[PDB]
Structures are given as structure tokens and as C-alpha cells.
Amino acid sequence: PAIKTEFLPPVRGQITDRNGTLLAINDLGFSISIKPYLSIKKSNKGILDKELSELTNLFPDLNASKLAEIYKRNDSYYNQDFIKVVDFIPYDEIIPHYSELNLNKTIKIDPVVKRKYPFGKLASHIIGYVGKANLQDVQENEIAKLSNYTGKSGIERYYNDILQGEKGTRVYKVNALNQEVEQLSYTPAMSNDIELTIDIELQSYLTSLFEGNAGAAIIMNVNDGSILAAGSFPEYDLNPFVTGISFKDWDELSNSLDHPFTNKLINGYYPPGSVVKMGVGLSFLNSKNISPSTQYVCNGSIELGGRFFRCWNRSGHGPVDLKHAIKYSCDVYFYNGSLQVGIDQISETLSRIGFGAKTGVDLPSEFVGTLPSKEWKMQRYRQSWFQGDTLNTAIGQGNFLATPMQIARYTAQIAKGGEVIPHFLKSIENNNTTIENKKEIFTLFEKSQLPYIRDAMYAVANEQGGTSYRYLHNLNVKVAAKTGTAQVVGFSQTDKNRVDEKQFEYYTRSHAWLTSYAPYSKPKYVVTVLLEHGGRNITSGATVAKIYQKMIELGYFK
Ligand SMILES: [Zn+2]
Numbered sequence: 001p002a003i004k005t006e007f008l009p010p011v012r013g014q015i016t017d018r019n020g021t022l023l024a025i026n027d028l029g030f031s032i033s034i035k036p037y038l039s040i041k042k043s044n045k046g047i048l049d050k051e052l053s054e055l056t057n058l059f060p061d062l063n064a065s066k067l068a069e070i071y072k073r074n075d076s077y078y079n080q081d082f083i084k085v086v087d088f089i090p091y092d093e094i095i096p097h098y099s100e101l102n103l104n105k106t107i108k109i110d111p112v113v114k115r116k117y118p119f120g121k122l123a124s125h126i127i128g129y130v131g132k133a134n135l136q137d138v139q140e141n142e143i144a145k146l147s148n149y150t151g152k153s154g155i156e157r158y159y160n161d162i163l164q165g166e167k168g169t170r171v172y173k174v175n176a177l178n179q180e181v182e183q184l185s186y187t188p189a190m191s192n193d194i195e196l197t198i199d200i201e202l203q204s205y206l207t208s209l210f211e212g213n214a215g216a217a218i219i220m221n222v223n224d225g226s227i228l229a230a231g232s233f234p235e236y237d238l239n240p241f242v243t244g245i246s247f248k249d250w251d252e253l254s255n256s257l258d259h260p261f262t263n264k265l266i267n268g269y270y271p272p273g274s275v276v277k278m279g280v281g282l283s284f285l286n287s288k289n290i291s292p293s294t295q296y297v298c299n300g301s302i303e304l305g306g307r308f309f310r311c312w313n314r315s316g317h318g319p320v321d322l323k324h325a326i327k328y329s330c331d332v333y334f335y336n337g338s339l340q341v342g343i344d345q346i347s348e349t350l351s352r353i354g355f356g357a358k359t360g361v362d363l364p365s366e367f368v369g370t371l372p373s374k375e376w377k378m379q380r381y382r383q384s385w386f387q388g389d390t391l392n393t394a395i396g397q398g399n400f401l402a403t404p405m406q407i408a409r410y411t412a413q414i415a416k417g418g419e420v421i422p423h424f425l426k427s428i429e430n431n432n433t434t435i436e437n438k439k440e441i442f443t444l445f446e447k448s449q450l451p452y453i454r455d456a457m458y459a460v461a462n463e464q465g466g467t468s469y470r471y472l473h474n475l476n477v478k479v480a481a482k483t484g485t486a487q488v489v490g491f492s493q494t495d496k497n498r499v500d501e502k503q504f505e506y507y508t509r510s511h512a513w514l515t516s517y518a519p520y521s522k523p524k525y526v527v528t529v530l531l532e533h534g535g536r537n538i539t540s541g542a543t544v545a546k547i548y549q550k551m552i553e554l555g556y557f558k
Helices: 047-058 064-074 091-102 154-158 160-165 200-209 239-243 247-254 274-284 323-327 331-341 344-354 374-381 385-396 403-414 444-448 450-462 494-497 540-553
Strands: 003-008 024-034 085-091 107-116 130-132 149-151 169-174 182-187 194-196 215-221 227-233 293-299 301-302 306-312 318-321 424-428 480-487 513-519 527-531
Touching: 024 047, 024 091, 047 064, 047 323, 047 450, 064 085, 085 149, 091 107, 091 424, 107 239, 149 154, 149 160, 149 331, 154 160, 169 374, 194 403, 200 215, 200 227, 200 540, 215 403, 215 540, 227 318, 227 527, 247 480, 274 323, 274 331, 274 344, 274 403, 274 450, 274 480, 293 331, 306 385, 318 323, 323 450, 331 344, 331 385, 344 385, 403 450, 403 527, 444 450, 450 480, 513 540, 527 540
Parallel strands: none
Antiparallel strands: 003 169, 024 085, 024 107, 130 149, 169 182, 194 424, 215 227, 215 527, 293 318, 301 306, 480 513, 513 527
16 A cells, blocks of 8 residues: 555664673764765866865865765766765764754765774674675575674674564555655664673783783683683784775785684684693593502603603603692603503593583584594594504693683583583673573592592692692682693694794794683682793793783682
């Protein structure tokens, strides 16, 4: 008839941090458009030059040169609308001069919304960016048809359905010339805001600790999984992604040996190294052949079937029991131990504390890495399993690959004694309704043996000559820890071309793990740091010492 109804898409929701600070907003602004025909018709000579000079005088950030250029490309006889020129001017920079532009009948000003992340680089891998709607995203969500913004990475991607909101509907009456005569009904679109667990103040501190370095970091509550901070480094500025990437922006994204475009936390995987010993050590204790105080002698190596497996301490550790084999990170103890225990036992135990398995985290496309096993080797390599492999695997090396997020889940679970799933989603504070919003993983015996593991972890950080004693032994929170190291085996012929000869050294220095938890007495937090190549101006332990010191300054242990 002449009753017609249109659909109104809502303003995409805002994203805040645990204490309310705004991480993704819709900046309000205006587009300036020019009346047509000012270069196509001889009558109006010099007309666009005039109204632009008044404009340039009003906002000098605008360049009258290029602006009249984009104009005459759109000024045509075939088109009779207004010719959009300025895409976006901030509301606050315009609303003084409003009435003068509105009442000017050569400039037409319309409101526009620009997605803006006020913290730029900070948290770029969690938050994410938005982008133009997808050809198959229109098949899935009809609200992106009307919007053309959809989440393309991060929370934005993961929680896109919640951030879209429901649409709104407006009914009106037309007539015989098709005109807005009477509005009939009108249900408005609604949108929701979400609050993450991160704290932007702590997120910032990580970024400046890591400034110049690379790697990953996670601060996570051990009781419920709430990620209080988490970074991949280096991070990128999000805002240039809403507007669109440049030809030049793509290069420095693809030819950069620090890989800032990649979420190392859950898309980067690395050899766990010595930090699996807590878990490998847990697999030992149910043998009757190994006990908390069984000793193996480390002469800096052992020999097996003609091949030599070294300890990292060429001059040998001596006799050690499990506690001190962890404390000093003796490889040789786990070599001997693993031989006793067998690979099946280590693998089974290692998979339950969360290796080679998604941590369950609410970011898109979490990688699982590689937890090696006889079954695994057989499909991936068409080769049987050799005691050599048990040995490499026992001390977190070989083909063993883990993501920083997995380490943190694992650390946390050792400290809690039970399941710990990491999450960023604190609450959904949808306008006029903030809505917010179990499998055992240790055996009954394995839980009885966990105090031994935790005492070893304490030693690593407070007893003289623990691999982390230098830095963690004088904190105002008693910390437990375990160190790890992953060496790099190869250096691609390309990556060499992308750097200069002097820096080759750095790019082959082994990686640094330090996972920790505090307070040893009543565990609350996990701090997992991974410095790519041991860092350029930070060190693993010093970073963790400072990350704990900042958390005390912010009362997160009060
Ligand atoms: Zn040793």
C-alpha cells in the first residue's frame, strides 16, 4: 500500500576494561558534501574555489588542494546528488560552527560514526579491529547487511554477534509522490556493551616493559580464569585498520622479523622446554620405582644406545632428587626418570594438564600446538617411536610445541589443583541490563603429590641457586616459578635477507620462558612471560619481577 517499514541497524557496542575504561568507541563526527555542477557548468565559475577557502580557513587540517580534486572527478551531469568531500570531521571540532554550515545551502553536513580505539597499540591482539562486511558474513548475520562494519579480529571478531545488537524497525506512511507523510510504529534497534577482564593500566605497563622486545605475557586469576592482562608483542595500532590498510602498510606487515601482526599468545607456539618438568615430574611419581626422594646422578650427560643426551650444565649437577632436579632444571633426572616411566605415561599425564589442546579461551582460532606421542609420530612422520624421543620429550624439547596461553593454563592448574579456563569476557553490560556470566583434571593420587611439585616451584624462586632466585626471592609477594628455554634450529634464507648481518646473532638466540604464580601460600595469579630470543633490553626474570611489582602497586594483592 502506502504503509512501508524500514530496518535500522544499531550503533555497534562499546568495549571497556575491568574498571570501566573505554577500549572501543564510536567517535561521532560529520561528513561535508558540496552542491553539484560547480565545475561542469560555465555559469558557476570560481564557485567551489570560494566556499572551500572559507572551509580551509575554518579547519586548516583540511587541504583545499586535494579536496577540490576528488570533487571534479565526481562532478558529472549523470549525477545530481551532493558530492561528498570530507569523510569525517570530529563533532567537537564542528559543533561551534554548526548553524553556519547547516544554514549554508552549498554545504550539506550529515552525521557519521567512526570506530575508534582510544588506546591505539595497547591490547591490539585482544580487542581487535573492525572491517568491511564479508560476502559470507551477509549470509550469516543480516545486521551486517545494514551496517557493513563487522568484527574482523580479536574480541571484535569473537563476540561479533553480541556487538552487532538486534536491529530496529520503523513504520511510516508514504503517498502518491512517495513522501514521508506520517510515521506509524517504531521499535528501536538495541546494542550491547561488553567489559573485558583486562586492566588497561596493567596492559600499558606490559607494553612499555616489552617496548623494543618481542614475545608474550599473561596475567591470569587462578580461581576463575579471568585474564587481568595479556599481550603479544610488539603490538600494532588498531585505528588504521578501520580506515583501511595502505600498500605500504602491507609491506611492513609482511617483511618484519618481529611479526607484530600475529597473536603470539594463542597463534604462536614454541617448545615448552624445562617448564614441563612439573608435569613430567607428576607423571613419574605413580611408579613405585620413582618417589619424591629417589635420586639420579647427573654427570652432565647420560649415554643411551650409543648416543649422548646432555644436561645444560656441562659440569654436571650431581645427585639430585625430583625437588632439586626441578629447582636446578636438571635435564638428566628426567632422562633417567622418563626411561623408567615410558612415553605413554608422560604423554597421558601431559595432555590432561592441557598440552596439545585448546585452552578454551574466547579469542578466535586458538592453536593447539604439538604434544608428542607414539600415535602422533606414526601419522605425522610414518616412523616408530625411539627412546631418544621419550628423552627429548621428557625435558620439553624435540617436537613438543606449546602456546603461551597453554603454559598459563598449565601453571594455573598446578597452583589451583583443578581446572582453570582462561577468559576475557567479564560482563555484558547491554543498555538497561548488565547480564555478566566441571571436569576434574588431576587423579586422586596425582593431587596428593602436587605439594611436592609446588615446593620445588618455590625453590626455583626463593632457595639459593634456583634458576629464578636472583629476581623473585625479594618480592613483597612470595612467588613460585619454573624457567624454560627453547632454542631455534634454523634460520630461513628469506628471514636472513630481511635483516642485516649484524643482527643475525640475535635472531638465533634461544627463547626464554618464565611462568610463575603468587602468592605461594594462597595462590591467586599466574604470570607467564615469553621473551623472544631472551629479549634485547629486558630479561625474563626482571620482566616478571616488575610485572609483580606493578600488581602490588595497584593493590591486586590487597
Ligand atoms: Zn643436570
